[PDB]
Design an enzyme around this catalytic site. Structure first.
Site, mmCIF file in Angstrom:
data_model
loop_
_atom_site.group_PDB
_atom_site.id
_atom_site.type_symbol
_atom_site.label_atom_id
_atom_site.label_comp_id
_atom_site.label_asym_id
_atom_site.label_seq_id
_atom_site.Cartn_x
_atom_site.Cartn_y
_atom_site.Cartn_z
ATOM 1 N N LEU A 15 0.861 -1.220 0.000
ATOM 2 C CA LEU A 15 0.000 0.000 0.000
ATOM 3 C C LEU A 15 0.880 1.246 0.000
ATOM 4 C CD1 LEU A 15 -2.778 -1.155 2.499
ATOM 5 C CD2 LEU A 15 -2.897 -1.042 0.009
ATOM 6 N N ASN A 19 9.787 6.453 5.920
ATOM 7 C CA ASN A 19 10.255 6.558 7.324
ATOM 8 C C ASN A 19 10.530 5.142 7.848
ATOM 9 O OD1 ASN A 19 10.840 7.999 9.792
ATOM 10 N ND2 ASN A 19 8.817 7.406 10.548
ATOM 11 N N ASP A 136 3.813 15.213 10.357
ATOM 12 C CA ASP A 136 3.849 14.823 8.922
ATOM 13 C C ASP A 136 2.466 14.969 8.282
ATOM 14 O OD1 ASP A 136 5.514 14.104 6.800
ATOM 15 O OD2 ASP A 136 5.060 11.964 7.027
#
Ligand SMILES: CC(=O)N1CCC(Nc2cccc3cnc(Nc4cnn(C)c4)nc23)CC1
Ligand SMILES: NC(=O)Nc1ccccc1
EC number: 2.7.10.2
Length: 282
Positions: A15, A19, A136
């Site tokens: 998917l 990081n 983020d």
């Protein structure tokens, strides 16, 4: 119920990644007949002590988040001892908002973009209430549950603020696209709920551009522009900002500019933004 057996998790596809982590589509298939439910499963791409500490933190943060606007924790699968191997989450087949906007733009009017904006804002209000800094926030890290429902995901960089401190300082440079970072993050690696508000301003920009690459933050920087990061910090310090997206309601662009106030203390709270988005929506 929150413990998944490794031998029942059947790999289907990738998917996404980032990081030091991957998210895989799996079927949890204890009957082994392909009738089990689909789940999104995060693991480290490879072993590493620092990444493992960060991963256990991510699990503990997401497990304690309960919101209609935050991707749902389902459970964990264990490696040796108490070492978390996989974080099991609900699967949202529609995928990330960035992709969804690009594909369905002809179908999604200003009212729908304001609905998504309101939902992300309510999610971020809740995160703030838990003293959680996301760090983020971007359309690539927001998932689509349905036509009229989005959820925040990707807590891999999320941090809990101590009770007596409303910011934290990171030692090493960030590895996310630089055009979502607040100036205090670019300059001094300072992150807060107010740096998440800056990033939310860029998310409003992404929504109202339908994440069109031609007017992406990167594209605009290259036209508006010495290391890139220093050049961006200079432009922002001079007061330069992303332009109003094509056909953007003036009030939405005004809200972006408030999110992009130079000093974090002068940016609106998510609590303040929420009613303003709801007012524009209706
Ligand atoms: C952009 C990128 O590489 N990303 C990493 C993977 C992440 N995906 C999900 C993370 C956590 C839970 C999820 C639940 N469902 C889904 N569904 C889905 C369908 N297509 N895609 C791309 C993602 N993704 C999740 C999106 C961001
Ligand atoms: N917040 C904001 O306006 N950022 C920016 C400015 C110029 C280029 C790329 C991003």
């Amino acid at each position: 119920p929150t413990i998944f057996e490794e031998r029942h998790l059947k790999y289907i596809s990738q998917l996404g990644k980032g990081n030091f982590g991957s998210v895989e589509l799996c079927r949890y298939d204890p009957l082994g007949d392909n009738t089990g439910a689909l789940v999104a499963v995060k693991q480290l791409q490879h072993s590493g002590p620092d990444q493992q500490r960060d991963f256990q933190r991510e699990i503990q943060i997401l497990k304690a988040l309960h919101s209609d606007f935050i991707v749902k924790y389902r459970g964990v699968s264990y490696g040796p001892g108490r070492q978390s191997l996989r974080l099991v989450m609900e699967y949202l087949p529609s995928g990330c908002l960035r992709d969804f906007l690009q594909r369905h733009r002809a179908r999604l009017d200003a009212s729908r973009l304001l609905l998504y904006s309101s939902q992300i804002c309510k999610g971020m209000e809740y995160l703030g209430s838990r003293r959680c800094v996301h760090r983020d926030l971007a359309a690539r890290n927001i998932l689509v549950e349905s036509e009229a429902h989005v959820k925040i995901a990707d807590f891999g960089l999320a941090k809990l603020l101590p009770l007596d401190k409303d910011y934290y300082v990171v030692r090493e440079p960030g590895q996310s696209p630089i055009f979502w970072y607040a100036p205090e993050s670019l300059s001094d690696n300072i992150f807060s709920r107010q740096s998440d508000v800056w990033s939310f301003g860029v998310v409003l920009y992404e929504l109202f551009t339908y994440c069109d690459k031609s007017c992406s933050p990167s594209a605009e920087f290259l036209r508006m522009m010495v290391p890139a990061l220093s050049r961006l910090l200079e432009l922002l310090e001079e007061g330069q900002r992303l332009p109003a997206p094509p056909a953007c309601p003036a009030e939405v662009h005004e809200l972006m500019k408030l999110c992009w106030a130079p000093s974090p203390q002068d940016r609106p709270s998510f609590s303040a933004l929420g009613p303003q988005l709801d007012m524009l929506w209706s």
